[PDB]
């Protein structure tokens, strides 16, 4: 496995008309465990070439999809036509607790349902009557996030002004969040737009209010959308380590919980690409140190369980160890049961801006070696954290396209692969075990100790399931 | 039945020059229609007799949806049996007018405003700002375009600028610049200067329209010069523009010129 | 905690007392959540008649639709024509959604692409992406055809797809003879069903408008079949089977069936089956064109009747018993072939199941929703079985439609107790089932929550959800069944009688309480 | 009381406080019923491991079978041969039950007659009734054939059906050439499946034994298909469809399909379809005979291999994926025709649903029961899907069978946690689902009570019942589905994944309690 990926790449990229050819050839390169930047090795976060079967989303998927949607005590209005909203109703599996319809409104979809006329005459006039109709039909709503779509960005409506007026009027916070589809290359801008959107309308409200008590342990889990319960699977360990979990950004989040982040002693950031932006304003404006952690599998969580510890006093540290000792027998037990089955079996991944690099450790522990990865909206700084987590011949892709991915899969010949729904089937047809990574394929928590357990089991039920051996019919 | 779209830099003379051309064309006993593809909504005000009637978009607002409107509601006959319809639009600084142009045109076509009557259909197109205001010149809309101009450095930059945009829809489609129509702002050597530009462009200067104050007498009195003062000097002029258009067979693909060659002309 | 040989997933894990504790401390700790009292209160409120009027007096907010945009309905149309590429002019996230969505329902590959129009696109218009995109896509995935679609992004800016396409041709990016049909698909107008019309008609024209001069009405003596937005493959197959067993010559324009069901045998197939262009090209020569779901194919009819000069039949969607005999009868009037003794048997076999199941179904009050043709279809068949179609909602329906349905209800005694609802979203129906409670609901997976909300109020108030329609994400492989004609009607019926029988078994499975009515046979 | 516009039936009525009062007074007044305390006690007891051993040590009492007598399996066999009359020699109430029973399942007419053997019959034998009965029946219902059967009554008194029949002939009651096959059907021996063998073979002989001298093996180049006791019409149809779409010649010996499904169109049809005698007569001239359920057609094979000299294939019931390709492959080995690309697709489409649904079905522990071929079939396919077939009961199974199934379980790891049970009745399985609890049960309507009893213990102990098999009385029109081959396997699967999905939706629909795992898509 030396200069093959190159013979692979330049062959996959052989079909691309020269306009795209030069471009793509720079998004996929061989990983040297040693560089510390990709300005030299690979390129990410650029415009996607037309009609190429990208999986990349839009700025909306970032604001109403990943960041805002997840706030259970708020009502996120999908301002714009009637398609975006409906398509993402309950798409993301960010779990929460509450009475939907009454107290929480997440598996719910509110839209301004733009019609022909709304577009012509533009419509803040509608958005306002609509911000009213909520306060009256959903009293327990504790604020309103207005996620913009593409039309709003072209028509040029002042959804920024209305939210000040209605809200200044209704004595309720309203976040004029701008997440226009035509904006940014990927979904990435959505995040950056969300982050800022938060430090401005929500975050800076409890500033002259000190009826709160900062404990030398108070912290917040930032960037754990809690897909499947990962946020709870982690909020459990921190708390069992003695730290006091105060906030959780997007994932059973409370609008108020987000408002108490400024008072904490430390910001724990799992998802770097999404809340990295905010965590810095979190530290400049307020002056609250933050760090990156990883709760995928034993060795990562165990390790991290100590890093967050050292940022405090010895007190918490001895307590930490107790937690590690507690789960030590459980996770060891898991490996003893499943590593035997997953050992040797190699795996190929493709995701957004975190899991691509963050799941490998969870794998190392199970003995599955990762021979390929990629992001759909990460940047060089995100790959900066990848090269190390990887091997040498390893092939990496950034905004990989059907042809690009499919041919690598056809050639690298993986035992297991992990990516989204759009891809889940293409490979399940080539008889290659596929395990959804985005939605965890509707399976239990993967973060933390309890999570690792399910994971180590979910790779086994799919990878070694009987189905695969039954693909090619006998007569053939 | 021909369909001609009339363009220009706003404030040179699109509406009067058109409503007067069709007024004349009506005089010749032609079945004509004027689609007002402009937010201002005065493209028919001179043939119908008032500030403006009920527009498509404004009208479709009342019924909730455009699909709920009826041609009967926007289409009104006026002088010499000329039919008129307005595209409608939002007010200064809100909404999207470029859309109305689309919505209104799609509507007329959709409701068969074209199918059984007319000889000429004139789209009075406002500012060519974006996608929507190009609607009058795709396939099945307008085949002849008559850019209006004057002897002003900015009047031509526009005549030039507009035709440029046309080559986009002209190459791929069949729409063609038929010629320019000059409304003398009584600038010097304005006459041939335009003829100059019409050549460096690849078209003709259909006709030259005088600066005759009978147009304000008619404009302010709520009517066209042809119904106002049938024999007035500029009444015939507008009749000439009509006759020339009818018999015109020259439709080309514009050839924009560069600022340099442009200012050269004037200079 | 997690024990190895009995791993607890999403559900048992947070139930553990250790986790409950956690959540409580979080809730009492930083959520500043309202006290259950008022939460229960506000809920108690929404479930009332007072709240309902408030609800319906609604005019600007919409909570939980029963519709989607046009581009989604376009893409499905395109999937039907052999080796074509659903191509969507505009943003890429939509294509990402259009795809993800069609995946969860059919659970198979959904190929579609987009010119990825970035910020500059909106500003400068989208000419090069259309130009290149047509080239790249055509070069990479090697379609035989590409049918362009558009998001709001292209609509507002008013990108002329036509011109944009032709420049690319003249400009030398794609073979001038390469089929590239288009349609403007304003997501902010009509609905997904509408997209299908615009998308279809677009193609109906690309192959026929120019070549109209040499085609004769009924040159190939066949019968055109226009589906419309249809997501149950069983329906595509069933309609083909009948005509086919009639010895009727037909041509199904836009047929998804192979492509949305490519076998998992080791070879991935981006394309399969589909309507041939040469077939779409030759369409005019047929005897006549049939539109299965005409209420969202209104622009097709205008063309077919207008350009092809086809005397298009005034037929309803082939659902239930009557509408089916009518469908077949008319096909019989046209192809020349008799209604096979085969099909007649089938009919009688359906009427047999009705007489046999009539007792349980008789009088069951339902609430239901979906597309205009579906609901108009379902409702009908519900009267045939003798059920009261109490609340009928159709979010993307229109006035001419509503009236048509009311009349279908004025005809039978079972229907006079039902009201129609158009332009009303799901959240409205949440109220309807509370103030005037159904027996069951017949809709998509989205009706999973209206179900839940009725239970929280009281088990005696819970309204079970029977899943017929689209989407259907919480269940597997239903997309394969049929809802059209006799065949698909045998199933609708069984689904309900057994949907009812099941509830009765649950309502009466209480020991020494309700079990006396636990009849072994029903 | 009852109010006119809201009539409360059997279950709502007795719930009314007025009626509850009544029952309490009856109970406390004249029932001398035990106090709930000990009732709950005795129950609590039966649901234990202590009770189970006691249960199984059982050796004389039987509680709730999973079999029926032989005459019932005979009658169904007969229904299969064209225009024949299920004729049962003996008591008349037997056929009155045989009929009533087959009704509730298929819910169509079930014709069968009986020589009403009164008391004198037992005492003097049953000659006249056989003599007359053959005449009367043959005269009234005008058959082409009458296949004689026998209730307990004739077996003991050992009436020679053969002699009895021939006397009637010679004695001149029925045309000597009139087909009247027969078979002693000792209800007190074997089971209903056994009757089907005896009844079939009887006929397989009547038309061949004498004529063996002039038939050549494979003279018509066709393939015989012996179904056996089968009650899902979908299975008769599906097996015919495959061979038929293979271009394979065949003859379904014993074909109920038309007769058990006569269209209600105004004309009653005592007979329809069926296997022609001239067809059964010519049977030996085929290439080879195939037995879809060998485990209850053991006497047929003896004859076919012996008299017809057919090299009968060693195939298992065509269920699940592997046993189907094997069925088709072998048919391909014989007919000459290859496996059509059509069928191959189908297969791949099934494997697609497996890969697609594998997650939910993986590891689900089941308890099941039915006939020997069915259970052996179902179990198999359950391992294919990757479920643990924990408790496998087969009341009419035997030793050679049991140990063939165990071995099928020895192969896969998903089968190493399951036990087989033969000669054990339902009441035994009631215990097994309590001591070692499933997920669900897969049986007939009789398993409706094992379900109820699990709930009374605790909702968290309730074992839902998935109805596959026979009987199925508490549901409607399931008799039309299929359980054999690919087609009938697409269904089995959907029926579980969605059987599971449904439960997860019920277990998790508690607001702010378990509804968090209420995923919109699964
Ligand atoms: N023949 C003419 N000579 C001099 N001035 C004229 C003549 N015809 C029209 N005008 C003047 O031109 C001005 C605008 O005329 P017109 O209605 O044609 O405007 P326009 O620019 O075409 O409108 P829009 O661009 O808003 O569609 C009025 O002030 C009018 O008096
Ligand atoms: S694909 Fe995380 S940067 Fe974002 S929806 Fe998933 S690998 Fe996202 S960890 Fe996350 S909770 Fe996600 S899985 Fe950062 S939030 S835009 Mo698709
Ligand atoms: S990037 Fe307009 S209705 Fe909504 S899916 Fe579109 S066609 Fe349909 Fe992102 S903000 Fe939304 S999903 Fe902009 S428009 Fe796509
Ligand atoms: S420039 Fe044109 S497309 Fe853009 S918002 Fe204005 S009128 Fe609409
Ligand atoms: Ca699939
Ligand atoms: Ca029946
Ligand atoms: Mg004007």
| CA quadruple C175, C176, C180, C186: dihedral, nearest 10 | 120
Residues C345 and C380 grouped into a single domain: no
Q: Which of A201, A233, A248 is the last residue of a domain?
A: A201
> Which one of D157, D183, D214 terminates a domain?
D214
Which residues of C19-133 form beta strands (DSSP E)? 62-63, 84-90, 113-116
Is chain C touching chain D, with at least 3 CB–CB pairs below 8 Å?
Answer: yes
Q: Which positions in chain A have a beta carbon within 8 angstroms of at least one beta carbon in chain D? A: 89-91, 93, 95-100, 103, 107, 425, 428-429, 441-443, 461-462, 465-468, 470-471, 473-475
Verify cis geometry, omega within 30 degrees of 0, for the bond prior to D403.
Answer: no
C-alpha dist (Å) from residue A346 to A371, C291, D385: 7, 51, 24
State the DSSP string of D100-123.
HHHHHHH-S----EEEE--HHHHH
Question: For residue B226, what is the enclosing H or E element?
Answer: helix B225-228
Q: Please indicate, yes or no, whether residues C331 and C296 belong to a single structural domain of this protein.
A: no
Cα distances from C237 to residues A14, A15, B183, C243, C491, in angstroms, run 40, 37, 66, 10, 15
Number of domains composing chain D: 4
State whether D514 and C15 contact (CB < 8 Å). yes
Q: Of the candidates D192, D214, D236, which is a domain's last residue?
A: D214
| Exposure string over B210-249, b if 16+ CB within 10 A, otherwise e | eebebbeebbeeebbbbbbbeebebbebbbbbbbbbeebe
Catalytic positions of B are 9, 14, 40, 127
At residue D217, φ and ψ (nearest 5 deg) are -65, 115
Is residue D387 a contact partner of residue D359, using CB atoms and an 8 Å limit? no
Burial of C375 (0-12, 13-18, 19+ CB in 10 A): buried
Longest alpha-carbon distance in chain B? 55
Q: Strand (E) positions, A6-74? A: 29-30
**Range of D300's domain?**
215-319
User: Cα(C99)–Cα(D389) distance, rounded to whole angstroms?
Assistant: 38
Query: Which residue has tokens 């029977």?
Result: C466
In a domain, C43, yes or no: no
Q: What does the alpha-carbon distance between residue D52 and residue B129 come to, in Å, rounded to a whole number?
A: 86
State whether A180 and A81 are in the same domain: yes
Catalytic residue among D156, D189, D217, D351: D156
**Is residue D35 one of the residues assigned to a domain?**
no
Q: Name which of A67, A63, A352, A88 is nearest A180 in CA terms.
A: A63
Distance CA C486, CA C324 (A): 7
* Joined tokens for residue A358: 């963050």
Indicate whether A323 belongs to any domain: no
**Closest CA relative to residue A255, chosen from C31, C23, D512, C27:** C31
**Residue C61 belongs to some domain of the structure:** no
Domain-ending residue, one of A201, A218, A244:
A201
Residue A331 domain flag: no
CATH code (residue A109): 3.40.50.1980
In a domain, A379, yes or no: yes
In chain B, domain spans: 1-267
Structure tokens at C146: 């590409």
Q: Chains A, C in contact: 3+ Cβ pairs under 8 A?
A: yes
Choosing from C156, C186, C214, the residue where a domain stops is: C214
Question: Do D355 and A428 lie within an 8 Å CB cutoff?
Answer: yes
Distance (Å) from the alpha carbon of C278 to chain A's nearest alpha carbon: 25
Instruction: Give the count of domains, chain A.
Output: 3
Ligand 3 site, residue C191, Cβ cutoff 6 A: no
Do residue C74 and residue C194 come from a single domain?
yes
D9 exposed, middle or buried (CB, 10 Å; 0-12, 13-18, 19+)?
A: exposed
Q: Is residue C210 part of a domain?
A: yes
The verdict on A178 and A298 lying in the same domain is no
Instruction: Give the separation between CA A340 and CA A343, rounded to whole angstroms.
Output: 5
Q: What is the CATH number of the domain that holds C347?
A: 1.20.89.10
State how far residue B41 is from chain A, nearest Cα, in angstroms: 15
Distance in angstroms (rounded) separating the CA atoms of residues D406 and D401: 9
Between CA D90 and CA D92 the distance in angstroms is 7
- Is the same domain home to C199 and C84? yes
Contacts of C39 (CB under 8 A, 6+ apart): A99, A102, A103, A140, C33
> Are D387 and D248 part of one and the same domain?
no
Ligand 4: residue whose CA is nearest its atom 3 = C157
* C-alpha distances out from residue C96 to C101, C167, C202, D248, Å: 9, 27, 23, 47
- Expt. technique: X-ray
> Do C67 and A31 meet the contact criterion of CB atoms below 8 Å apart?
no
CA-closest residue to ligand 3 atom 13: A181
C-alpha–C-alpha distance, residues A375 and A348, integer Å: 12
- D51 inside domain: no
Beta bridge partners of B36: B86, B124
Question: Residues A91, A182: one domain?
Answer: yes
Does residue A266 belong to any structural domain of this protein? yes
Chain D residues near residue A101 by CB distance under 8 angstroms:
none
Is A377 found in the same domain as A287? no
Q: Kindly write down the DSSP assignment for every residue of D165-217, as one continuous string.
A: HHHHHHTTSS-TTS---B----TTSS-HHHHHHHHHHHHHHHTTTGGGGG--T
Ligand 2 residue neighbourhood (C-beta within 6 Å) = A 66, 92, 187, 223, 225, 227, 271, 273-274, 351-355, 438
D509 contacts on C by Cβ (under 8 Å)? 451-452, 455
In which domain, by residue range, is A172 found?
Answer: 59-201
> Would the CB atoms of A466 and D352 count as touching at under 8 Å?
no
C-alpha to C-alpha distance for A465 and A458, rounded to whole angstroms: 10
Do D348 and D203 fall into the same domain?
no
**Residues in chain B, total:** 267
Residue B189's nearest CA partner among B208, B202, B174, B164 is B208
Output the domain CATH number for residue C454: 3.40.50.1980
- How far does the centroid of ligand 2 lie from the alpha carbon of residue A188, in Å? 10
Phi, psi of A416 (to 5 degrees): -135, 150
Q: Looking at the domain assignment, is residue A141 inside a domain?
A: yes
Domain check: are C231 and C185 in the same one? no
The values of phi and psi at residue A230, to 5°, are -55, -30
B/e letters for D312-345, b = 16+ CB within 10 Å, e = fewer, are bbebbbbbbbebbbbbbebbbebbeeebbeebbb
Is D176 in the same domain as D207? yes
Residues D279 and D409 in one domain: no
Query: Rounded distance, CA D456 to CA C518, Å?
Result: 14
C121 neighbourhood in chain A, CB within 8 Å: 182
Task: Answer yes or no: is D296 within a domain.
Answer: yes
- Note whether B82 and B23 are within 8 A (CB): yes
Question: Could you count the other beta carbons within 10 Å of the beta carbon of residue D46?
Answer: 18
Same domain, C133 and C150: yes
C17 part of a folded domain: no
Based on the domain organization, do D333 and D242 belong to the same domain? no
Give the length of chain A.
Answer: 476
Resolution of the model in angstroms: 3.0
Query: Which class does domain B1-267 fall in?
Result: alpha beta
Residue C146 and residue C88: Cα distance in Å, rounded? 9
For C466, the enclosing helix (H) or strand (E) is: strand C465-467
**D152 catalytically annotated:** yes
Q: Which residue of B38, B41, B87, B95 is the best one to mutate when testing the A interface, meaning the one whose CB has the most A CBs within 10 A?
A: B95
Indicate whether A394 and A309 sit together in one domain.
no
Going by the DSSP 8-state scheme, the letter that residue B148 receives in this structure is: E
D48 domain residue, yes or no: no
Look at the block and give the residue holding tokens 């009339």: B6
**D397 and D431 share one domain:** yes
A338: nearest Cα among A177, A192, A464: A464
- How far is it, in rounded angstroms, from Cα C103 to Cα C83? 19
> DSSP letter string over C88-103?
EEE-SHHHHHHHHHHH
Pairing outcome for strands C388-394 and C62-63:
unpaired
């Amino acid at each position: 496995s030396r200069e093959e990926v190159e013979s692979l790449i330049q062959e996959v990229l052989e079909v691309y008309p020269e306009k795209a050819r030069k471009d793509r050839n720079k998004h996929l390169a061989v990983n040297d465990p040693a560089v510390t930047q990709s300005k030299k090795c690979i390129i990410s976060n650029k415009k996607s070439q037309p009609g190429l079967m990208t999986i990349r989303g839009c700025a909306y998927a970032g604001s109403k999809g990943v960041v805002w949607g997840p706030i259970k005590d708020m009502i996120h209005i999908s301002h714009g036509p009637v398609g975006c909203g409906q398509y993402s109703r309950a798409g993301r599996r960010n779990y929460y607790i509450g009475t939907t319809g009454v107290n929480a409104f997440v598996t719910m979809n509110f839209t301004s349902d733009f019609q022909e006329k709304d577009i012509v005459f533009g419509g803040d006039k509608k958005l306002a009557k609509l911000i009213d109709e909520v306060e009256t039909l959903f009293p327990l709503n504790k604020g309103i996030s207005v996620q913009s779509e593409c039309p709003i960005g072209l028509i040029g409506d002042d959804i920024e002004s209305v939210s000040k007026v209605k809200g200044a009027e209704l004595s309720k916070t309203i976040v004029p969040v701008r997440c226009e589809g035509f904006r940014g290359v990927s979904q990435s801008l959505g995040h950056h737009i969300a982050n800022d959107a938060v430090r401005d309308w929500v975050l800076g409200k409890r500033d002259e209010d000190t009826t709160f008590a900062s404990t030398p342990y108070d912290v917040a889990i930032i960037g754990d959308y809690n897909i499947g319960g990962d946020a709870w699977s982690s909020r459990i360990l921190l708390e069992e380590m003695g730290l006091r979990c105060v906030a959780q950004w997007s994932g059973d989040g409370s609008i108020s919980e987000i408002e108490l982040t400024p008072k904490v002693k430390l910001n724990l950031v799992h998802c770097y690409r999404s809340m990295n932006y905010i965590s810095r304003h979190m530290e400049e404006k307020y002056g609250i140190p933050w760090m990156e952690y990883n709760f995928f599998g034993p060795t990562k969580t165990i390790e991290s369980l100590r890093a967050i510890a050292a940022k405090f006093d010895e007190s918490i540290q001895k307590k930490c160890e107790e937690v590690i000792a507690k789960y030590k027998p459980e996770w060891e037990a898991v490996v003893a049961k499943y590593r035997p089955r997953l050992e040797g079996k190699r795996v190929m991944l493709y995701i957004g801006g975190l899991r691509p690099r963050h799941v490998i450790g969870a794998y190392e522990d199970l003995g599955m070696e990762v021979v390929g990865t990629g992001y759909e909206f990460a940047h060089n700084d995100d790959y900066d954290r990848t090269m190390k987590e990887m091997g040498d011949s390893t092939l990496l892709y950034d905004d990989v396209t059907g042809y690009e991915f499919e041919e690598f899969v056809k050639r690298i010949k993986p035992d297991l692969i992990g990516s989204g729904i759009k891809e889940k089937f293409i490979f399940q047809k080539m008889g290659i075990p596929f395990r959804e990574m985005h939605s965890w394929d509707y399976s239990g928590p993967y973060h933390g100790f309890d999570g690792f357990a399910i994971f180590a089991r979910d790779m086994d039920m799919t990878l070694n399931n009987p189905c695969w051996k039954k693909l090619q019919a006998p007569w053939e | 039945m021909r369909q001609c779209a009339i363009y220009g830099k706003g404030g040179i003379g699109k509406s009067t020059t058109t409503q007067n051309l069709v007024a004349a064309l009506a005089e010749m006993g032609k079945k004509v229609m004027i689609v007002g593809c402009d937010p201002k909504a005065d493209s028919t005000r001179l043939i119908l007799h008032s500030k403006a009637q009920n527009t498509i978009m404004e009208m479709a607002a009342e019924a909730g949806t455009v699909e709920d409107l009826e041609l009967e509601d926007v289409l009104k006959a006026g002088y010499g049996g000329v039919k008129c319809v307005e595209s409608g639009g939002p007010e200064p600084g809100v909404g999207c007018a470029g859309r109305g142009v689309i919505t209104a045109i799609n509507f007329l076509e959709e409701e068969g405003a074209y199918e059984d009557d007319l000889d000429f259909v004139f789209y009075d197109v406002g500012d060519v700002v974006c996608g929507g205001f190009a609607m009058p010149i795709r396939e099945n809309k307008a085949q002849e375009i008559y850019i209006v101009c004057s002897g002003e450095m900015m009047a031509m930059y526009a005549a030039n600028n507009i035709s440029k945009g046309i080559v986009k829809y002209a190459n791929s489609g069949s729409v063609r610049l038929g010629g320019l129509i000059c409304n003398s702002r009584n600038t010097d050597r304005e006459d041939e200067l335009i003829i100059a530009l019409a050549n460096k462009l690849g078209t003709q200067m259909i006709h030259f329209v005088p600066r005759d104050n009978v147009v304000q007498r008619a404009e302010i009195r709520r009517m066209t010069v042809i119904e106002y003062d049938p024999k007035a000097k500029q009444a015939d002029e507008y009749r000439a523009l009509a006759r020339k258009v009818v018999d015109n067979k020259l439709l080309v693909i514009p050839n924009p010129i560069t600022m340099d060659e442009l200012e050269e002309l004037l200079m | 905690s997690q024990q190895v040989d009995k791993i607890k997933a999403s559900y048992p894990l947070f139930l553990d007392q250790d986790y409950k504790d956690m959540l409580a401390k979080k809730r009492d700790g930083f959520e500043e959540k309202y006290p259950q009292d008022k939460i229960d209160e506000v809920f108690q409120w929404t479930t009332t008649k007072e709240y309902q009027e408030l609800n319906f007096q609604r005019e600007a907010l919409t909570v939980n639709p029963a519709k989607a945009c046009q581009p989604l309905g376009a893409v499905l149309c395109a999937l039907g024509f052999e080796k074509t590429m659903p191509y969507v002019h505009g943003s890429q996230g939509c294509v990402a959604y259009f795809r993800s969505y069609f995946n969860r329902h059919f659970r198979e590959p959904v190929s579609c692409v987009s010119d990825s129009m970035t910020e500059d696109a909106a500003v400068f218009g989208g000419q090069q992406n259309m130009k290149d995109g047509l080239q790249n896509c055509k070069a990479t995935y090697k379609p035989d055809m590409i049918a362009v679609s558009t998001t709001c992004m292209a609509e507002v800016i008013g990108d002329d797809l036509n011109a944009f396409i032709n420049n690319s041709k003249k400009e030398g990016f794609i073979p001038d003879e390469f089929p590239v049909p288009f349609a403007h698909t304003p997501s902010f107008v009509g609905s997904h069903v509408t997209g299908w019309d615009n998308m279809f008609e677009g193609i109906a024209r690309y192959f026929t408008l120019k070549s109209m001069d040499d085609k004769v009405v009924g040159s190939n003596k066949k019968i055109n079949i226009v589906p419309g937005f249809e997501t149950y493959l069983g329906n595509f197959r069933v309609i083909k089977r009948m005509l086919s067993e009639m010895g009727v010559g037909y041509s199904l324009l836009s047929d998804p069936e192979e492509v949305l069901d490519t076998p998992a045998d080791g070879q991935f197939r981006m394309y399969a089956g589909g309507t041939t262009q040469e077939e779409m090209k030759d369409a005019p020569n047929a005897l006549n064109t049939v539109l299965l779901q005409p209420w969202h194919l209104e622009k097709t009819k205008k063309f077919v009747e207008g350009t092809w000069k086809h005397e298009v039949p005034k037929l309803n969607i082939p659902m239930g018993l009557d509408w089916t005999d009518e469908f077949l009868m008319k096909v019989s009037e046209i192809s020349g072939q008799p209604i096979p003794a085969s099909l007649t048997k089938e009919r009688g076999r359906l009427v047999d199941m009705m007489t046999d199941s009539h007792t349980w179904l008789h009088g069951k009050r339902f609430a239901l929703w979906g597309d205009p043709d579906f609901v108009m279809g379902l409702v009908k068949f519900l009267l045939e079985l003798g059920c009261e179609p109490v609340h009928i909602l159709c979010h993307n329906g229109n006035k001419r439609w509503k009236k048509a349905v009311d009349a279908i209800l004025a005809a039978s005694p079972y229907g006079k107790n039902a009201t129609v609802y158009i332009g009303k979203d799901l959240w409205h129906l949440r109220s309807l089932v509370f103030t005037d409670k159904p027996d069951f609901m017949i809709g998509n997976s989205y009706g999973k929550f209206i179900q839940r909300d009725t239970l929280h109020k009281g088990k005696e108030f819970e309204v079970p959800l029977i899943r017929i329609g689209f989407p259907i994400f919480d269940r597997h492989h239903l997309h394969r069944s049929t809802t059209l004609g006799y065949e698909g009607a045998m199933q609708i019926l069984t689904t309900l009688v057994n949907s009812i029988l099941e509830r009765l078994d649950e309502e009466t499975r209480g020991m020494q309480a309700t079990d006396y009515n636990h009849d072994l046979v029903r």
